[PDB]
Amino acid sequence: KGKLPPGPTPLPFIGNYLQLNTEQMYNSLMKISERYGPVFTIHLGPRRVVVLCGHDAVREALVDQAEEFSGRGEQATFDWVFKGYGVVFSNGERAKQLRRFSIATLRDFGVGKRGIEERIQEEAGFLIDALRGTGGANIDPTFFLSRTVSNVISSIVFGDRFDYKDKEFLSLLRMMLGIFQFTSTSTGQLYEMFSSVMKHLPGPQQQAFQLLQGLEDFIAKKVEHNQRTLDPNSPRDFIDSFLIRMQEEEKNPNTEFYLKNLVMTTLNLFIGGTETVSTTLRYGFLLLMKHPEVEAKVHEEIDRVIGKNRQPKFEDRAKMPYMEAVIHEIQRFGDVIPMSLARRVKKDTKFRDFFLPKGTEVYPMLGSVLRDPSFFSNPQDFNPQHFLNEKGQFKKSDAFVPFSIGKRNCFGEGLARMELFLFFTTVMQNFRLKSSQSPKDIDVSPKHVGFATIPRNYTMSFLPR
Ligand code: HEM
Numbered sequence: 001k002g003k004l005p006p007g008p009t010p011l012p013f014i015g016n017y018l019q020l021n022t023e024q025m026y027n028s029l030m031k032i033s034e035r036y037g038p039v040f041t042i043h044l045g046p047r048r049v050v051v052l053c054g055h056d057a058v059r060e061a062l063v064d065q066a067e068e069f070s071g072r073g074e075q076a077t078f079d080w081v082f083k084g085y086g087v088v089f090s091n092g093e094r095a096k097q098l099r100r101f102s103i104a105t106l107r108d109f110g111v112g113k114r115g116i117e118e119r120i121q122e123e124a125g126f127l128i129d130a131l132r133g134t135g136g137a138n139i140d141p142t143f144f145l146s147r148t149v150s151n152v153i154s155s156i157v158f159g160d161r162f163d164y165k166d167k168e169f170l171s172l173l174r175m176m177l178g179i180f181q182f183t184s185t186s187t188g189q190l191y192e193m194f195s196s197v198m199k200h201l202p203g204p205q206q207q208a209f210q211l212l213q214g215l216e217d218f219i220a221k222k223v224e225h226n227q228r229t230l231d232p233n234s235p236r237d238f239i240d241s242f243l244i245r246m247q248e249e250e251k252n253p254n255t256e257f258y259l260k261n262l263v264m265t266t267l268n269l270f271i272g273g274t275e276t277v278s279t280t281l282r283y284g285f286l287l288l289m290k291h292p293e294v295e296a297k298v299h300e301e302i303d304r305v306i307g308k309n310r311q312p313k314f315e316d317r318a319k320m321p322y323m324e325a326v327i328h329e330i331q332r333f334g335d336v337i338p339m340s341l342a343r344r345v346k347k348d349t350k351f352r353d354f355f356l357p358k359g360t361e362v363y364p365m366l367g368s369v370l371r372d373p374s375f376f377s378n379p380q381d382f383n384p385q386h387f388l389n390e391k392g393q394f395k396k397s398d399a400f401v402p403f404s405i406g407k408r409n410c411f412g413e414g415l416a417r418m419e420l421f422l423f424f425t426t427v428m429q430n431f432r433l434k435s436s437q438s439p440k441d442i443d444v445s446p447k448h449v450g451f452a453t454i455p456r457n458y459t460m461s462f463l464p465r
Pocket residue numbers: 072087088089099153268269272273274276277280336337340341342343402403404405406407408409410411412413415416
């Protein structure tokens with residue numbers, strides 16, 4: 001219609017700030033959607049953004065017009081350090097170049113293959129030892145899980161795992177959890193609107209920047225070490241591979257393979273390969289203790305298909321529809337990245353009689369699809385049946401989009417699914433979950449919701465079975 005999607009009239013500079021609640025962006029947007037429709041325009045400060053709500057609107061854009069919506073938008077906090085470099089926040093040629101290399105290199109190191117499956121199984125065994133080590137005490141699982149998860153991707157990018165005792169490793173994981181939570185707080189979402197000003201003011205954002213610089217510094221050190229010990233004929237990990245390609249691209253003035261893209265791309269994979277799976281696992285166990293009946297059914301299936309002796313393997317999932325449904329329901333309820341990572345229209349285009357000019361930022365509301373009442377009967381309830389038919393067999397859903405969809409969807413989905421199944425299964429096979437409080441007093445509502453969905457802090461006991 002030559003006109004952008006409908007939305008509330010914005011004010012100079014602050015945009016629609018007054019009609020939004022930074023502490024509850026999702027609820028604020030859904031409220032506006034009820035008045036303007038499933039597809040609308042919003043102004044986060046001066047950033048004009050088109051919001052897509054519900055399965056239909058999201059799929060039509062990201063898949064039906066995949067190319068048109070294949071551009072990458074921004075996440076102001078992360079942009080502070082990335083500045084458009086690296087695979088995640090890059091665009092155009094840089095994006096096509098870095099993504100293609102990352103996926104291939106990832107495959108070269110076992111992802112999607114027996115190689116990484118064995119890596120995950122071994123790390124899962126280390127988690128089991130670590131959990132038995134607690135002696136059934138009631139502890140905070142947070143870093144036990146993130147250390148295990150992080151060691152998988154760390155093996156690939158750094159060529160080796162971290163010792164669970166390594167204090168520098170714990171420091172890194174704390175940096176990641178800190179940034180992740182900051183982007184999900186009110187100040188974090190306020191930052192998304194007013195970064196032009198806030199990046200220069202005192203406040204929590206400065207601490208978040210500190211944590212990003214800490215992470216970047218660690219990667220820079222790793223790169224330098226690999227540089228002065230590199231064997232161009234035999235790469236030890238993702239970093240070496242990128243370094244070799246960089247050597248080959250030296251006589252190319254326009255190459256995308258240079259130090260800054262190496263540092264940022266590796267940072268993307270280190271953070272990306274750690275925080276979301278870790279958060280999903282953490283939310284998952286809380287959900288299971290909240291619903292004892294589900295844990296019991298999971299135990300019945302594991303003992304039947306796998307038993308108590310052997311280590312779970314990825315091929316076991318095809319014989320475990322219940323576990324498969326439980327994990328899917330954990331990702332659906334968890335809604336870890338509720339508004340996905342912002343996209344951007346790559347070229348002027350028409351969408352549902354709306355005119356979207358090149359460069360227009362887009363917010364695919366994944367959370368609104370994971371809870372779309374047209375695909376799930378009681379979207380607000382944690383219920384594995386959402387992914388099972390009456391015969392107890394696994395039932396797929398077009399609205400299951402926790403990894404998003406389209407041209408810039410998560411290429412870490414393969415690794416993540418294998419980690420979620422092996423870690424969830426191996427932990428449940430060996431332990432019974434014991435909550436600190438009664439199932440009735442357990443609060444599963446999120447602590448923060450912004451860029452991500454963060455579960456409340458909690459402690460628990462892992463009692464051997
Ligand atoms: C349960 C875990 C995970 C969730 C929920 C998740 C979610 C997402 C989402 C929603 C996106 C944005 C997609 C889009 O723009 O349309 C994405 C991007 C991405 N994810 Fe993940 N992810 C997970 C795990 C992984 C893992 C394990 C890695 C690391 C190997 C990873 C790396 C990436 C990368 C590199 C991108 C950017 C892709 C691009 O811009 O082309 N993710 N992820």
